[PDB]
A paper describes a structure:
Therefore, the Phe9 and Pro10 that had previously been removed to rigidify the scaffold were re-added to the peptide. Interestingly, the complex crystallised with four protein molecules in the asymmetric unit, of which only two Grb7-SH2 domains were formed in complex with the peptide. The other two protein molecules remained as apo-proteins, as similarly observed for G7-18NATE bound to the Grb7-SH2 domain. Asn7 formed hydrogen bond interactions with the Grb7-SH2 domain Leu481, which is understood to underlie the Grb7-SH2 domain specificity for the “YXN” motif. Only amino acids 1 and 8 differed in their positioning relative to G7-18NATE due to their substitution with Lys and Glu residues in G7-B8 for the formation of the lactam ring. The G7-B8 peptide, however, bound in the expected orientation, making the same contacts with the surface of the Grb7-SH2 domain as first observed for G7-18NATE. It can thus be concluded that the lactam linkage, unlike the more hydrophobic olefin staple, did not outcompete Phe9-Pro10 to form surface contacts with the Grb7-SH2 domain.
Growth factor receptor-bound protein 7 (Grb7) is an adaptor protein that is important in breast cancer cell migration and proliferation.
Numbering used by the authors:
A (entry chain B): 429 to 460, 464 to 528
B (entry chain L): 1 to 10
C (entry chain A): 425 to 462, 465 to 528
Write the structure that this text describes.
C-alpha cells in the first residue's frame, strides 16, 4: 500500500506532506507500538489521528473513536474515509507515497 | 423511511 | 464484483428470501443480498426470528458511483464494502451480519 509509510516520525510526515504541496486531502498512514497515525492535510494544516486496536468477542479491529466505528484493517479504514468524512474535516483525496 | 422497507435513518 | 460472493442471490423475490432464511434456521445475523426486480439491491436480514429488508440504492458523486441505505449519509463503493463494514458496525441495522445465507 503506497499510502502506508511504516516507522516514520511525526516530523518526517509533515515534511513529506509539505514537500508534495500541502494539497487538500493529502494523507498518509504511519506507525505511532500497536497503534497507527493517519496524517491528513486540511487548509495547509496537518492533523494526526491515532488509530488503536481492540478486541471484542474474539475479533480484532481498529478504531479512531474508541469503538464507535470499527475496521478489520487499515485498508478498510482508508477506503471508508475516502467516501465518508466521519470524524475527519475532509475526505482522503490524494495519497502521500 | 423507504416505503415498504425497514430502513430507519434521519 | 458482488457476483463472486455466496451471500449474493441475484434477482429473487422478497418471499423467496424469507423462505431461504427459513431454510437455514432463522438464526440471528443470517443475511443475504438480492437484486431489485424493478440497479438497486435489497439486504434481507434475520433478527429476533423476524426477516427485515433494507433497500440499497445507487448514486453518483462527481463521476464516482456509490451505494447507500440511508440516502447518502453512509456511502460504499460496492456491495462488498457495504457487507464487511456491517459485519463490525451496526449502522442503521438492528444487529450485525453474522451468518451468510448461501
Amino acid at each position: 500500500q503506497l499510502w502506508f509509510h511504516g516507522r516514520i516520525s511525526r516530523e518526517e510526515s509533515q515534511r513529506l506532506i509539505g514537500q508534495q504541496g500541502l494539497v487538500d486531502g493529502l494523507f498518509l498512514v504511519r506507525e505511532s507500538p500497536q497503534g497507527f497515525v493517519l496524517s491528513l492535510c486540511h487548509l495547509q494544516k496537518v492533523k494526526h489521528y491515532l488509530i488503536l486496536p481492540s478486541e471484542e468477542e474474539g475479533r480484532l479491529y481498529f478504531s479512531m473513536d474508541d469503538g464507535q466505528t470499527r475496521f478489520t484493517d487499515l485498508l478498510q479504514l482508508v477506503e471508508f474515509h475516502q467516501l465518508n468524512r466521519g470524524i475527519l474535516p475532509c475526505l482522503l483525496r490524494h495519497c502521500c507515497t | 423511511k423507504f416505503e415498504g422497507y425497514d430502513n430507519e435513518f434521519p
